[PDB]
Amino acid sequence: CAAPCSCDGDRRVDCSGKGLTAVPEGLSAFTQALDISMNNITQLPEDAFKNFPFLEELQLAGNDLSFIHPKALSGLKELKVLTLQNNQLKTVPSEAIRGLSALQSLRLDANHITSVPEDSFEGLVQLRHLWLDDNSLTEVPVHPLSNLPTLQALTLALNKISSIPDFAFTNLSSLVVLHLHNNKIRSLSQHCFDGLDNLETLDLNYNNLGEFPQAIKALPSLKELGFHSNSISVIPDGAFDGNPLLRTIHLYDNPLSFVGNSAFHNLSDLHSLVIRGASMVQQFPNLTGTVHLESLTLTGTKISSIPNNLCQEQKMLRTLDLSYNNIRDLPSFNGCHALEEISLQRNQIYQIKEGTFQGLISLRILDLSRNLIHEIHSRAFATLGPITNLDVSFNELTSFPTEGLNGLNQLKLVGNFKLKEALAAKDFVNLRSLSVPYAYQCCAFWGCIHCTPSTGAFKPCEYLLGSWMIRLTVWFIFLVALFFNLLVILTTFASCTSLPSSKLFIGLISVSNLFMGIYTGILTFLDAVSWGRFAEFGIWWETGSGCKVAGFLAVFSSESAIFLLMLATVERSLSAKDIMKNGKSNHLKQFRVAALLAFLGATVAGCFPLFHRGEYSASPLCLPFPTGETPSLGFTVTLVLLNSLAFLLMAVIYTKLYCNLEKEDLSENSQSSMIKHVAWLIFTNCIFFCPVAFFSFAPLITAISISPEIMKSVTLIFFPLPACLNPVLYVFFNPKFKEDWKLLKRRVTKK
Amino acid sequence: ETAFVEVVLFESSPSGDYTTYTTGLTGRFSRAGATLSAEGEIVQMHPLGLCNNNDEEDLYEYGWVGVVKLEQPELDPKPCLTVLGKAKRAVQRGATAVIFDVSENPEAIDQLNQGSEDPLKRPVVYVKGADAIKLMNIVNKQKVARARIQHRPPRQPTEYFDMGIFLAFFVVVSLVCLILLVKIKLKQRRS
Amino acid sequence: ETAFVEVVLFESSPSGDYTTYTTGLTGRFSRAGATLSAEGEIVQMHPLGLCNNNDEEDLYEYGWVGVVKLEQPELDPKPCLTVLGKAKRAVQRGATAVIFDVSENPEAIDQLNQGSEDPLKRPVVYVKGADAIKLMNIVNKQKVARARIQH
Amino acid sequence: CKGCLSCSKDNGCSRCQQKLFFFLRREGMRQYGECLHSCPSGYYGHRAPDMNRCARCRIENCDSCFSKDFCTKCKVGFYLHRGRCFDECPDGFAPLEETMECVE
Numbered sequence A: 001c002a003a004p005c006s007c008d009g010d011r012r013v014d015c016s017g018k019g020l021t022a023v024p025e026g027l028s029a030f031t032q033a034l035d036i037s038m039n040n041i042t043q044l045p046e047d048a049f050k051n052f053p054f055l056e057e058l059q060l061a062g063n064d065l066s067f068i069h070p071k072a073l074s075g076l077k078e079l080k081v082l083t084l085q086n087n088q089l090k091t092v093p094s095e096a097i098r099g100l101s102a103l104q105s106l107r108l109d110a111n112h113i114t115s116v117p118e119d120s121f122e123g124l125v126q127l128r129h130l131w132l133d134d135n136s137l138t139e140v141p142v143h144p145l146s147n148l149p150t151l152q153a154l155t156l157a158l159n160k161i162s163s164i165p166d167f168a169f170t171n172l173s174s175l176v177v178l179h180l181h182n183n184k185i186r187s188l189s190q191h192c193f194d195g196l197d198n199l200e201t202l203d204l205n206y207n208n209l210g211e212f213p214q215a216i217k218a219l220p221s222l223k224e225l226g227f228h229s230n231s232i233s234v235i236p237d238g239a240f241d242g243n244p245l246l247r248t249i250h251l252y253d254n255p256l257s258f259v260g261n262s263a264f265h266n267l268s269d270l271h272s273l274v275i276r277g278a279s280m281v282q283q284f285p286n287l288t289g290t291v292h293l294e295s296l297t298l299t300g301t302k303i304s305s306i307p308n309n310l311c312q313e314q315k316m317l318r319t320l321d322l323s324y325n326n327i328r329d330l331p332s333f334n335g336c337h338a339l340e341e342i343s344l345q346r347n348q349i350y351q352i353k354e355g356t357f358q359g360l361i362s363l364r365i366l367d368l369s370r371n372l373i374h375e376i377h378s379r380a381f382a383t384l385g386p387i388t389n390l391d392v393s394f395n396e397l398t399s400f401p402t403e404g405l406n407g408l409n410q411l412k413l414v415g416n417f418k419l420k421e422a423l424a425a426k427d428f429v430n431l432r433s434l435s436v437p438y439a440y441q442c443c444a445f446w447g448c449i450h451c452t453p454s455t456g457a458f459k460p461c462e463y464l465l466g467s468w469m470i471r472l473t474v475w476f477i478f479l480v481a482l483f484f485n486l487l488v489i490l491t492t493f494a495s496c497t498s499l500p501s502s503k504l505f506i507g508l509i510s511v512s513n514l515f516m517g518i519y520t521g522i523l524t525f526l527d528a529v530s531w532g533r534f535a536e537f538g539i540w541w542e543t544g545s546g547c548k549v550a551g552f553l554a555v556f557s558s559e560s561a562i563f564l565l566m567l568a569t570v571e572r573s574l575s576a577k578d579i580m581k582n583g584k585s586n587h588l589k590q591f592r593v594a595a596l597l598a599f600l601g602a603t604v605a606g607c608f609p610l611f612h613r614g615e616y617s618a619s620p621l622c623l624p625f626p627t628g629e630t631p632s633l634g635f636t637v638t639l640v641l642l643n644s645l646a647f648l649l650m651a652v653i654y655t656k657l658y659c660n661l662e663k664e665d666l667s668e669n670s671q672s673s674m675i676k677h678v679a680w681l682i683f684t685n686c687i688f689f690c691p692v693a694f695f696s697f698a699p700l701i702t703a704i705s706i707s708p709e710i711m712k713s714v715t716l717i718f719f720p721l722p723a724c725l726n727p728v729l730y731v732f733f734n735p736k737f738k739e740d741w742k743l744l745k746r747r748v749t750k751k
Numbered sequence B: 001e002t003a004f005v006e007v008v009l010f011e012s013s014p015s016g017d018y019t020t021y022t023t024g025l026t027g028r029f030s031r032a033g034a035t036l037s038a039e040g041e042i043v044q045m046h047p048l049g050l051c052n053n054n055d056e057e058d059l060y061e062y063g064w065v066g067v068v069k070l071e072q073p074e075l076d077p078k079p080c081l082t083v084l085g086k087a088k089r090a091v092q093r094g095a096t097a098v099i100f101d102v103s104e105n106p107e108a109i110d111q112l113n114q115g116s117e118d119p120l121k122r123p124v125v126y127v128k129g130a131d132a133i134k135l136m137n138i139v140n141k142q143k144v145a146r147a148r149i150q151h152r153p154p155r156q157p158t159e160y161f162d163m164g165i166f167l168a169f170f171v172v173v174s175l176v177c178l179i180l181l182v183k184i185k186l187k188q189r190r191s
Numbered sequence C: 001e002t003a004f005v006e007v008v009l010f011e012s013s014p015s016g017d018y019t020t021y022t023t024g025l026t027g028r029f030s031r032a033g034a035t036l037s038a039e040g041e042i043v044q045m046h047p048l049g050l051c052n053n054n055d056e057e058d059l060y061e062y063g064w065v066g067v068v069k070l071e072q073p074e075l076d077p078k079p080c081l082t083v084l085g086k087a088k089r090a091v092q093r094g095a096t097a098v099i100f101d102v103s104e105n106p107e108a109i110d111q112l113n114q115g116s117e118d119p120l121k122r123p124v125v126y127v128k129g130a131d132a133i134k135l136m137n138i139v140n141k142q143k144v145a146r147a148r149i150q151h
Numbered sequence D: 001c002k003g004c005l006s007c008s009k010d011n012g013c014s015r016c017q018q019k020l021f022f023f024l025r026r027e028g029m030r031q032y033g034e035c036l037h038s039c040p041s042g043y044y045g046h047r048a049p050d051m052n053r054c055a056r057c058r059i060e061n062c063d064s065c066f067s068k069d070f071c072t073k074c075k076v077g078f079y080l081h082r083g084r085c086f087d088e089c090p091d092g093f094a095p096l097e098e099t100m101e102c103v104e
């Protein structure tokens, strides 16, 4: 056991990674296994292994070997394993390995071999395993291989072989495993595999086969046959006639178009059959005889009907995937006692009968999403066993049965917009994950179960308004706005006199505000009616016309009020100019027409969401201001940008008129009261519009997150706050209202 | 203080993947242990198995959820270790949690929940009634199962939101009062 | 949405009892998984270890908290699976929780927290900075450890 | 980081050289990559253009396997026959005890 070679008592010497440049010397004459891999031997001199007559295993991996003398391996009459992978050999050393009369395993992979001499492998009468993959071979070495009748395993992968000639393996009767993956094989002659009667595994993955390899019919003992990642498109009838013992076929990642109907018949040992993308197949494959199938997969085809005897033939079937087809009617699944997973999504099933799923005692996962199911029998799931996952999402469901569903863990029904009824929570004891078309169906299950969509603050379950403080505040706003708006309207329009533009505009803002008051009253009345049970009313309210009407009223009132404020401020500025410009303003008819135009614009703005779908149904409040949508965000940002532009326009107009206004001009002039009133109105309106605008801008900025209840409460408390506030300033701060009320009192007393 | 227990059953597929079936349960976190969340392989365990001080016969891996089924005190006139002692010993033997079935002995509820100054770092849960019998059926019927005790923090923390609601209500009321005081002041000044 | 990860260490005393040392950590619950509390034995998994579709080599017992350290994206120009796919595969292989070390891949948080309509039933956590290096040191120094993700 | 192109301290090697095998070594709780010129016992090399990976010998009763379903040598007490391990040599074949496989 001379240094630097490690040595144990089993006659095995290890010298890997010692940086040797030649074979080590001084070792025991009785060495049986020598390992000199990972060394730096770039050449083997003549008779370099004359000191190891009893050698049996030799390794030269990773040595950058380039030239081997013909007599280098002389005297190795007991060599059994010789490895030469990961080197710089460019031709197979036929002369050197001629004397190895007892070799059984030879490795030549990961080299730069390009040509095999015709006389190679002579004398290797005991060879069993041959490695030749990862080289630069361009053709099958038929003649050199013909000298190895005892070969059992041969690999030629990762080469540059283009085609296989006829009778390339006429000898090699005892061959069992042949590998040819990652080659460039495109053409196989009809009798290329003749003589391989004992072959069991054939590998042809990652090749360029265009047509089906008909030559495989001369392999009666085939068990595995893989040609996936190829260019095979059509598999003709009786393709596997000559291989009755097939177990697995690898044919995925292929441009498959059509499959013969009787291609996969008999084949009594086939275990799995997965075919995808066979878009030209119309009938279910004729699987008579195939009784050992444990998994079926036929997706992307035009299959329309499932044969009835599918469960009678495939006794041991475990998984059945038949998605992406044109299946309309389902057969009776009785007898598929071993069936566990069924996938039928993206089909055209329009109903489920009572007996469709009878006898599936082992069913665990069932998929039926993206179908046209409009009716499910009430007892359709009575006979199920440990069913854990059910999926009926994206269908035309109107009611959902619940018997026998106690064992469910995950259930999906998202997309069934026609499903309005509420699921009973007592029939889903073990349910853990749920999905429903509307969040209001999730209220019953939560025991305050990860269900979606979440019943957030914007979609309440018990109380529409929420806290009692918010309810009281909204009630107070409603009553104050209603009563004060009637008072102001009656006072302003109860005198049959000429109405100046200021008084007309104040009354017009008041009547506009009356509709926001009506909207708040609708909110409080709906909340009071649905006190504690809003979950039942939520779906009917949102999908019904009531939400549309309330949202239209709110939007119309807000926009009409804003535009009326714009026109009133413009009129005030114009009249202020005209006071010393002409002394007489004659724009009454024009201002009336402009007010009508503003009202019609508000009406069209309110009616715009009606044509769109789902804009008004985001929240039970029926306001466009969302919790985050892609269309509603656009509509709201357009509206709020218009409002902010309006606000800055009125602000700059008011600052301009204040700058042009002289300080002493406000001492006793009557219009001073009106201009102060308009200033206060714009003050409160612009102040109270900021929170809604900033919360609608909030989801555009990801750096700030607000819990839903905050925006819900501030919108409930601030959107109609100007509604109640605006007439209060007019009634309690405008001296003109005093004389107007006195005139109305005199008129009432006279009548 | 409510405890939610999930019992998971494994089925090792030949390919190597796992299929799970979870059974819900409800218990109550005892005051003798922290109200944390735990998880570990379920290990059935006789009440008298903790009596022996020779632990060499019970070398389990760390992180096993213990399940103990108590019995009538009549058949055990002299319990060598109290229920709290049993929980402590089980935790010392590497149990990540202890689940007691106190349906047979209801006094164990008040024995665990009595005022004690020595809580355990791992949760101690007690179950009774139909839940206890269901858990017992699963543990003595299935071979191996994994328990997942979830603390499930209580109803949504509406504290700060409620303070904001009161802030808004107070702001509205103060605004109303300010407007009223301003109006009466102006009335007095004009009068 | 922050996650508190506790690392526990064992030493089986001859008498039979166990003594535990605990070490704190801090991660963030990724949106790709539910924000539940998990616990199990820590098992580091190579990023390329989730590629293989033949799981027969690595049949682990249920309830192992997997720790995966992602590598820089230019070192993996073509990935077999996205981070979400890797986490889903790990959950398939019986993992009760998945922890990603995203110090070298700052975009992992981006493709994890991104809007996905198929969240995983088990929590997915990512760590970075001092916590990540401390966790990796614990992984590659101690023989065995058990993680306790809390919420 | 022996025979490695991109190495890390926690994950070991992440990409081996061109003609090398990438084997994932499981050391208790720690897993990391490794590059070897030949797959270890119980594994078979699978050449591929993007990377060569070791895979476990799925054939039962096997120590070293040429491929997925071909065993070069089984453990003691089992007989080699066409790459299959048999506790006894089937009909028409007699056991050979000296070097442990079936012969005619």
Ligand SMILES: *[C@@H]1O[C@H](CO)[C@@H](O)[C@H](O)[C@H]1NC(C)=O
Binding pocket: A019, A021, A040, A042
């Ligand atoms: C291997 O030997 C060659 C030829 O002498 C030499 O050039 C080369 O540096 C050696 N490589 C090593 C020692 O890694």
Ligand SMILES: *[C@@H]1O[C@H](CO)[C@@H](O)[C@H](O)[C@H]1NC(C)=O
Binding pocket: A146, A147, A148, A149, A170, A171
């Ligand atoms: C190979 O087969 C051919 C055709 O049958 C035959 O002529 C030849 O002798 C065989 N070679 C060997 C070495 O058995």
Ligand SMILES: *[C@@H]1O[C@H](CO)[C@@H](O)[C@H](O)[C@H]1NC(C)=O
Binding pocket: A261, A262, A265, A266, A286, A288
């Ligand atoms: C299906 O296969 C059986 C058995 O091979 C055969 O008798 C029958 O004619 C085939 N049917 C069709 C429609 O091809």
Ligand SMILES: *[C@@H]1O[C@H](CO)[C@@H](O)[C@H](O)[C@H]1NC(C)=O
Binding pocket: A244, A265, A266, A288, A289, A290
């Ligand atoms: C399968 O082939 C055998 C003969 O090898 C024949 O007896 C049997 O009827 C065939 N079955 C089918 C379904 O074609």
